[PDB]
Design a binder for this molecule. Structure first.
Ligand SMILES: Cc1cccc(Cn2nnc(-c3o[nH]c(=O)c3C[C@H](N)C(=O)O)n2)c1
Length: 258
């Protein structure tokens, strides 16, 4: 029985309305719940969905060099596979294996609609509008490592800003954009940015294009007997249009903007 780690982010994984009446994997619904079921059915294994204990995607602690988040759950044996919007990055590939991507994304900028910011460079050259990103995720790592002048300027500001411009959850980032009256911009992936832009109260927007181009992948620990079969499953699901089907199922709700 394969232990799956994932993260409670709508629309990937959500508690069903009647979850108290249900058990095990039946408590959950969403894109990654369906994807887990499809991967398991194609590979022929039983599995148990679990929510990442520390709530994080995953970064290497600068002091202890210990990985946290879903990455750490794989590296140190709490889970066998991660099925989540987990970004494929070279630093993470040092310690875990990824499938080919099942969804594309890029780093992007979220603002309150009407805020006078058109680009990363616009953000970088001012301080009235604070801006930041998620702790222990791939976007913070991207900015920390970037040698692009604009992005390094942004990092130099973010890493030393007080009070902190970083958030612990993606929902907190979005809430801070909304609560700040245009005085906070959140650096987050284009998936969440566009998903939120389409939903009530319809007060946020993605500005400029994306800052990079990456993907989400299914992750396994190095040496896992599962890696090969999981990668083949993702490729077949993609080819068969199942990933398109899951996006069409989970991305668009009734009663949203427009
Ligand atoms: C549609 C939808 C709804 C909610 C959440 C998501 C996934 N997601 N969107 N943005 C992020 C994100 O932004 N900066 C980061 O660091 C991460 C995390 C990143 N994916 C990582 O692996 O570290 N993660 C997508």
């Amino acid at each position: 029985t394969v232990v799956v780690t994932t993260i409670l982010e709508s629309p990937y994984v959500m508690m069903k309305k009647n979850h108290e009446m249900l058990e095990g994997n039946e408590r959950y619904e969403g894109y990654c719940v369906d994807l887990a079921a499809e991967i398991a059915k194609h590979c022929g294994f039983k599995y148990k969905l679990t929510i990442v204990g520390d709530g994080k995607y995953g970064a290497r602690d600068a002091d202890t060099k210990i990985w946290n988040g879903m990455v750490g759950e794989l590296v140190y044996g709490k889970a066998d596979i991660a099925i989540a919007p987990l970004t494929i990055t070279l630093v993470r590939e040092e310690v875990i294996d990824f499938s080919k991507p099942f969804m594309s994304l890029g780093i992007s900028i979220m603002i309150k609609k009407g805020t006078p910011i058109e680009s990363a460079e616009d953000l970088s050259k001012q301080t009235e509008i604070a801006y930041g990103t998620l702790d222990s995720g791939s976007t913070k790592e991207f900015f920390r490592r970037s040698k692009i002048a604009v992005f390094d300027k942004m990092w130099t500001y973010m890493r030393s800003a007080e009070p902190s411009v970083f958030v612990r959850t993606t929902a907190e980032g979005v809430a801070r954009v909304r609560k700040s009256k245009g005085k906070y911009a959140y650096l987050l992936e284009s998936t969440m940015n566009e998903y939120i832009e389409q939903r009530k109260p319809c007060d946020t927007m993605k500005v400029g294009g994306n800052l990079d181009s990456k993907g989400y992948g299914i992750a396994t620990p190095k040496g896992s007997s599962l890696g090969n079969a999981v990668n083949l499953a993702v490729l077949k699901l993609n080819e068969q249009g199942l990933l398109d089907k899951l996006k069409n199922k989970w991305w668009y709700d009734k009663g949203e903007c427009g």
